[PDB]
Amino acid sequence: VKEVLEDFAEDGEKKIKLLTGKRVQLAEDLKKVREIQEKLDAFIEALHQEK
Amino acid sequence: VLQKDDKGIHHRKLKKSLIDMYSEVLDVLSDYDASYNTQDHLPRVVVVGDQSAGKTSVLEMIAQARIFPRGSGEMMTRSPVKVTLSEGPHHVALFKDSSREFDLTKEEDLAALRHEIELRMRKNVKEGCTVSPETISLNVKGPGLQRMVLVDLPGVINTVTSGMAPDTKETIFSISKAYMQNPNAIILCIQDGSVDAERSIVTDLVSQMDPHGRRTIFVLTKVDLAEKNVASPSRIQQIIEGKLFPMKALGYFAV
Amino acid sequence: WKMVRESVEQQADSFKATRFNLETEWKNNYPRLRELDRNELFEKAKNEILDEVISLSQVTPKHWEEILQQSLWERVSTHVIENIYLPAAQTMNSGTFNTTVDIKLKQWTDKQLPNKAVEVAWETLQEEFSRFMTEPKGKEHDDIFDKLKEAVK
Amino acid sequence: EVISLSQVTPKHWEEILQQSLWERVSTHVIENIYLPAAQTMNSGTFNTTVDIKLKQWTDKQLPNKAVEVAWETLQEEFSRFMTEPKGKEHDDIFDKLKEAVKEESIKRHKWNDFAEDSLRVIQHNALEDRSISDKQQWDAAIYFMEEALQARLKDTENAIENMVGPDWKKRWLYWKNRTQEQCVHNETKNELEKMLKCNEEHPAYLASDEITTVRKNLESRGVEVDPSLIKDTWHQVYRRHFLKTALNHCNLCRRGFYYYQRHFVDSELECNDVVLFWRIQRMLAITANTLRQQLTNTEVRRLEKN
Amino acid sequence: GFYYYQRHFVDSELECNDVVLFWRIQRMLAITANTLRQQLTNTEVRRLEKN
Ligand SMILES: Nc1nc2c(ncn2[C@@H]2O[C@H](COP(=O)(O)OP(=O)(O)O)[C@@H](O)[C@H]2O)c(=O)[nH]1
Ligand code: ALF
Ligand SMILES: [K+]
Ligand SMILES: [Mg+2]
């Protein structure tokens, strides 16, 4: 069981398929929206620095 | 401190601080959002048109290096190819995720860029069709470049021949509308200049997605055929003036 | 770049709306839900699996032996009754009855019985392992770990 | 005699193979498939849960056990034909050769190695088709399901009586008493029975708070119980509770539907367990026929040849 | 009668299948109508207002 858990930990694809609980996907969407928001905030701040 | 200097203003705030970071914003949003419904605010330098040979040439006019797939008698641009343009040490380039630096003054590195692009296109496109929306990304620098992000999109066919899957034209239109439907995008229509203005395949699309002439710029390829009268000079003058467009247009330039 | 400065900034409104909607769904239904991405859920399921497997490893011998005896008896009762006991019962000489029974039992031991015993032990271990790994027979279970628990099982 | 064995009617093969094989797998479905699936009130999940297990179980175990039963079943009749006495008349002088011949013949009796592949397709189709439009199909399935459940109920009840010992009826009738463990089990049973008395729908899984609650309820009467004793007590009593409920569910399934005016009453009596049982009964019946066809077409001839 | 109760352990004379068909038709129509209403109020009605 421990070896299999290690293999799943290393196996990204099997984790992707297994972890499709729709809450993992909601968390991923929230995190990605936050990351794009941070990138957008930095980008907009730089734009205002350009004016 | 080194990250602050390199990832922010390394003496080039406009060209460096937020041009590559703009490309990162686009890449991260495209990673999160496969669709472009959320990319309306992010403009792009979009090149669209027919299978005209000058589609590669205009992109090398803006990205002033012979870095794009070149070919004859075929639509080489299978999939979108993104290039980030900015100033820097002359004739230097990068290929995303290839861990390789390219010298744009030597044929070997330009060929390497084109071959990597072709391989990524051949992996984006599945058997039975010629185009795929999946993107390819470059970072090109040089004194002749502006702070611009370019995308090299497949030419419109509207018809399928030679055993090609019938879905190809709809796939092409979807790939090109992903950007042409972007309110903030800039559309460059590549017009083959070997035919009369009456034959323009992409005019009807921008005339609906950009009827106000706020994004679409038409560029005439093979301008030497106006000198030779192979293409009607009168219609060429009228397209220069813009009398032949059933729409408003952002501008017009010669290729 | 003019279009950039004009339009890119307002993309924050839709980003905030999306984050608000996701966090609203969480607060209403998943107040314990966090950035439960490919790593966090996997780790929690892994730890639960290891803990339940250890609990299995700690099962008392009494339960083990009782279930093993019951299962093997279920498997061998009718074999004994039909192939050894009843055929032997045809004789009125209990000594030849016992002789035949012992011979058949020795042959069955040599060829079949220990293989059925090992089958019983292995399948009983599988059954207890599944009971620990699979959904507990309750209402509190969160199925979100079922994919990994079953795949690992 | 081996030719006479080849004269055994399919009727005997199909019945013997079906009865023997089901008995071998009768508890696996009940304990590992049905009962845990019965822990949810969602009949769709119940049927969804079992079908996934059955198909996986079908691929890995069912055709391998089915052939083994058929391989043994043929040898069981062969031995009876071979060396069984003709009542009180028997030439035991020949038994050494007969068994010696059998051992060599069974060693060379290699069952068709592809029989399992046909059974997998058959079993997948037998399970895939869950449409029971016939009352007779319903009637047969429920009565046999009751027997399996009644067997489990008595198996649990007999284990319980040992766990708890005789009741006052036998303690005073036969001058018996309870061991201190049995005394604990009876009171541990009583508290669990009271809990189920109210929470009839209590899930099989017990919370440690229930374990603590029982302990304090028993400690409050001078009875100190290890949690492990309660859990072991809980499992047997719960099945007795559940199984009686299932049989009462079965009783209403047959009786309630039997009354004509009740067929337009949409009560919560989805006898999905009869659907599961019926398919298996059919699935094994088809499996036995496939085994019987292989048994009489290929395997018995190989036995005769060997 | 009813879908399930007409079949199991009963001498039903009914064998009703039209109810399931038209009930599924009702559900499909309701789902289609709700999807259309969502599409309308999200995109199409405001598109018409903009036009
Ligand atoms: N005569 C003429 N030839 C051109 C022009 N533009 C491009 N070509 C030639 O045609 C090739 C076009 O490249 P190609 O791969 O077909 O571009 P793509 O189809 O858009 O991917 C170039 O290598 C040029 O040699 C033009 O305006 N006039
Ligand atoms: F010829 Al192309 F896009 F490849 F116009
Ligand atoms: K071309
Ligand atoms: Mg091209």
Query: What is the C-alpha separation between D64 and D120, in angstroms, rounded?
Result: 10
Chain C residue nearest residue B19, CA to CA: C1
Using an 8 Å Cβ cutoff, are B132 and B121 in contact?
yes
**DSSP H/E element including D292:** helix D272-294
**What is the SS3 assignment for D123-159?**
HHHHHHCCCCCCHHHHHHHHHHHHHHHHHHHHHHHHH
Rounded to an integer, what is the distance from CA D265 to the centroid of its chain? Answer: 32
Go through B76-109 and write b for each residue having 16 or more CB atoms within 10 A of its CB, e for each that does not.
bbbbbbbbbbbbbeebbbbbbeeeeebebeeeeb
Other beta carbons within 10 angstroms of residue D194's beta carbon come to 12
Q: What is the CA radius of gyration of chain D?
A: 25
Q: Please, are residues B17 and B81 in contact by the beta-carbon 8 Å criterion?
A: no
**Residue of B13, B24, B41, B184 to mutate, testing the C interface (most C Cβ within 10 Å of its Cβ):** B41
Token pair for residue D113?
Answer: 């190695």
- Nearest residue of chain D to residue E4 (CA atoms): D270
- Of the listed ligands, the closest to the CA of B118 is 1
Asked if B75 and B68 touch (Cβ cutoff 8 Å), the reply is no
Residues of B in contact with C4 (CB under 8 A): 22, 42-43, 184
Under 8 Å between Cβ of D26 and D19: no
Atom of ligand 1 minimally distant from the CA of B55: 20
- Distances D262 to B88, D254, D265, D272, E16 between C-alpha atoms, Å: 86, 11, 5, 18, 16
Our measurement of the distance from residue E17's CA atom to the centroid of its chain's CA atoms, rounded to an integer in Å, reads: 15
Tokens of A29: 């969407």
Q: Is B153 helix (H, G, I), strand (E, B) or coil?
A: coil
How far apart are alpha carbons D32 and D61 in whole angstroms?
A: 13
Judged by CB atoms closer than 8 Å, whether chains meet at A47 and C19 is answered as no
**Mutation to test the A interface, candidates C15, C16, C39, C134, most A Cβ within 10 Å:** C15
Residue pair B100/B29 in contact by the 8 Å Cβ criterion = no
Q: Which atom of ligand 2 is nearest to the CA of B49?
A: 5
Annotated binding residues of B? 52, 54-57, 71, 77, 152, 222, 224
Edge-to-edge strand ranges of the sheet holding B81-86: B101-103, B92-95, B136-141, B81-86, B148-152, B45-49, B186-191, B216-220, B251-254
Distance B54 CA to ligand 1 centre (A): 5
CA distances from E43 to B175, B209, D274 (A): 22, 16, 50
**Dist CA B94 CA B2 (whole Å):** 20
3-state secondary structure of A8: helix
Asked whether the beta carbons of E9 and D139 are under 8 A apart, the reply is yes
Encoding tokens for residue D280? Answer: 């298996």
> H or E segment at A13?
helix A12-18
Method: cryo-EM
- C-alpha E51/C-alpha E40 separation (Å) is 14
Closest ligand 2 atom, CA of B69?
4
CA distance D65 to D17: 11
Please return the burial class of A43, using the count of CB atoms within 10 Å of its CB with bins 0-12, 13-18 and 19+: buried
Kindly write down the DSSP assignment for every residue of D18-67, as one continuous string. HHHHHHHHHHHIIIIIIHHHTTSS-HHHHHHHHHHHHHHHHHHTHHHHHH
Fill in the amino acid letter for B66. Answer: R
For residue B210, give every residue at least 6 positions away whose Cβ sits within 8 Å of its Cβ, in sequence order, or none: B180, B187, B216, B247, B248, B250
Task: Indicate the burial class of B194 (C-beta count within 10 angstroms; 0-12, 13-18, 19 or more).
Answer: middle
Under 8 Å between Cβ of B172 and B200: no
| Binding-site entries of B for Mg(2+) | 56, 77, 152
Distance CA E8, CA E13 (A): 12
Asked if residues B1 and B8 have their Cβ atoms less than 8 Å apart, the reply is no
In 3D space, the residue among D246, D270, D261 whose CA is nearest the CA of residue E3 turns out to be: D270
Q: How far apart are CA D71 and CA D184, in angstroms?
A: 48
Cβ pair B112, B120 in contact under 8 A: no
C-alpha to C-alpha distance for C118 and C126, rounded to whole angstroms: 12
Q: Look at strands B251-254 and B92-95 and give their pairing.
A: unpaired
Residues 6+ apart with CB under 8 A from C59: C128
Look up residue E29 and give its two tokens: 């129509």
Would the CA dihedral through B168, B171, B175, B181 be positive or negative?
A: positive
Strand-pairing partners, residue B103, are B92
Residue among D103, D113, C77, C51 at smallest CA distance from A2: C51
- Cβ-proximal residues to B127 (8 Å cutoff; 6+ apart), any chain: none
B147 contacts on C by Cβ (under 8 Å): 1
Tell me the torsion sign for CA atoms D129, D134, D135, D139.
negative
Q: Give the distance from CA D32 to its chain's centroid.
A: 11
Radius of gyration of chain C (CA): 30
CA angle E23, E24, E27 (to 5 degrees): 90
For residue D108, give the 3-state DSSP assignment: coil
Residues having CB within 6 Å of any atom of ligand 2:
B 49-52, 55, 75-77, 154-155
B80, B171 in Cβ contact below 8 A? no
HSE-up (13 A, CA, CB side) for residue B165: 13
Q: What is the CA radius of gyration of chain B?
A: 18
CA-nearest residue for atom 13, ligand 1, is B70
Distance (Å, whole) CA B197 – CA B244: 8
Round to the nearest angstrom and report the end-to-end CA distance of chain E.
53
Here the tokens at position C60 are: 């008392």
3-state secondary structure of B220: strand
Please give the helix or strand (H or E) that residue B82 lies within, else none: strand B81-86
Contacts of B85 (CB under 8 A, 6+ apart): B19, B62, B63, B140, B141, B145, B146, B147, B148, B149, B150
Residues in Cβ contact with D133 at an 8 Å cutoff, skipping those fewer than 6 apart: E7, E15
Using CA atoms, how far apart are residues C40 and C34, in angstroms rounded to an integer?
Answer: 9
Question: Does any CB of chain A come closer than 8 Å to the CB of residue C148?
Answer: yes
Q: Do chains E and A touch (3 or more CB pairs under 8 A)?
A: no
How far apart are alpha carbons C129 and B74 in whole angstroms?
Answer: 61
Q: What 3 state SS string does C2-39 have?
A: HHHHHHHHHHHHHHHHHHHHHHHHHHHHCCCCCCCCHH
Ligand 1 centroid to residue B115 C-alpha, Å: 17
Interface test with D, best of C132, C135, C147, C149 (most D CBs within 10 A): C135
**Nearest residue in chain C measured CA to CA from A16:** C38
In chain A, % helix, strand, coil (3-state, to 5) comes to 85, 0, 15
Q: List residues bridging with B238 in a β-sheet.
A: none
Per the CB < 8 A criterion, the answer to whether B58 and B188 are in contact is yes
Phi, psi of B62 (to 5 degrees): -85, -50
Q: How far apart are CA D130 and CA D136, in angstroms?
A: 15
Q: Which of A25, D125, D178 is nearest to C37 (CA)?
A: A25
Query: In whole angstroms, what is the distance from residue E51 CA to residue C140 CA?
Result: 53
Q: What is the CA radius of gyration of chain A?
A: 18
Q: Which chain A residues have a beta carbon less than 8 Å from that of C1?
A: 50
Exposure letters D246-281 (e unless 16+ CB within 10 A, then b): bbebbebbbebbbeeebbeeeeebbbbbbbbbbbbb
- Using CA atoms of B133, B139, B141, B147 in order, give the dihedral in degrees to the nearest 10: 60
- Distance separating alpha carbons of residues D276 and D17, to the nearest angstrom: 20
DSSP-assigned letters across all residues of chain C: -HHHHHHGGGHHHHHHHHHHHHHHHHHHH-TT--S--HHHHHHHHHHHHHHHHHHHHT--HHHHHHHHHHHHHHHHHHHHIIIIIHHHHT-S-HHHHHHHHHHHHHHHHHHTHHHHHHHHHHHHHHHHHHHHHS--SSS---GGGHHHHHHH-
Are A35 and B28 an interchain contact pair (Cβ–Cβ within 8 Å)?
Answer: yes
**End-to-end C-alpha distance for chain D, whole angstroms:** 14
For residue B97, give both structure tokens: 């995720």
For C9, nearest residue in chain B (alpha carbons): B41
| Secondary structure (DSSP) of B161-218 | -TT--TTHHHHHHHHHHHHHT-TT-EEEEEE-TTS-TT--SSHHHHHHH-TBSSSEEE
CA distance D12 to D289: 11
Residues flanking ligand 1, CB < 6 Å: B 51, 53-57, 69-72, 75-77, 221-222, 255
List, as residue ranges, the binding site of B for GTP.
52, 54-57, 71, 222, 224
* Angle, alpha carbons C45-C49-C51 (nearest 5°): 120
> Which three-class secondary structure string do you get for chain E?
CCCCCCCCCCCCCCCCCHHHHHHHHHHHHHHHHHHHHHHHHHHHHHHHHHC
Contact B145, B166 (CB under 8 A): no
Give CA–CA dist B178/B124, Å, rounded: 16
Whether there are 3 or more C-beta pairs closer than 8 Å between A and D is no
Helix pair angle (C113-133, C61-80), 10° resolution: 140
**Residue from D111, D112, D107, D106 nearest D82 by CA:** D106
Cα-flanking dihedrals φ and ψ of residue B93, to 5°? -150, 165
Chain A hits for B28, CB-CB cut-off 8 Å, are 32, 35-36, 39
Burial of residue B169 (CB within 10 Å: 0-12, 13-18, 19+) is: middle
Q: Determine what percent of chain B falls in helix, strand and coil, rounding each to the nearest 5.
A: 35, 20, 50
In whole angstroms, give the CA distance from residue E30 to residue E24: 10
In chain B, which residues have their Cβ closer than 8 Å to the Cβ of A35?
28, 32
Q: How many CA atoms lie within 13 A of D87 on its CB side?
A: 1
HSE-CB at D254 with a 13 A cutoff on CA atoms is 17
Contact check, Cβ <8 Å, D203/C90 = no
Please name the residues in contact with D116: beta carbons below 8 A apart, sequence gap of 6 or more: D63, D64, D66, D67
CB atoms within 10 A of CB B138: 25
Residue closest to B56 by CA, chosen among B222, B212, B174, B178 = B222
Tokens of B200: 């323009």
Task: List the one residue out of B206, B214, B149 whose CA is nearest residue B176.
Answer: B206
From chain C, the residues in CB contact with D95 under 8 A are none
Which 3 state secondary structure label does DSSP give B150?
A: strand
Q: Decide: C121 and C68 in contact? Cβ < 8 Å.
A: yes
Question: Are the CB atoms for B217 and B186 separated by under 8 Å?
Answer: yes
User: How many CB atoms lie under 10 A from the CB of residue C47?
Assistant: 11
Instruction: Point out the ligand 2 atom lying closest to the alpha carbon of residue B53.
Output: 1
Q: Half-sphere exposure of residue D220, counting CA atoms within 13 Å on the CB side?
A: 7
Instruction: Name residue, tokens 């495209």.
Output: B30
Which positions in chain B have a beta carbon within 8 angstroms of at least one beta carbon in chain A? 13-14, 17-18, 21-22, 24-25, 28-29, 31-32
Q: What is the largest CA-CA distance in chain D?
A: 74
> Is A36–B24 a contact, with Cβ atoms under 8 angstroms apart?
no
Tokens describing residue D50: 């079992």
CA torsion through residues B157, B119, B28, B94, sign = negative
Determine the residue type at A46. A
Residue D303: closest CA among D77, D115, D94, D86: D77
Q: What is the 3-state secondary structure (H, E, C) of B11-68?
A: CCHHHHHCCHHHHHHHHHHHHHCCCCCCCCCCCCEEEEECCCCHHHHHHHHHCCCCCC
What are the tokens at D31?
């304990």
The number of beta carbons lying within 10 Å of the beta carbon of residue C34 is 13
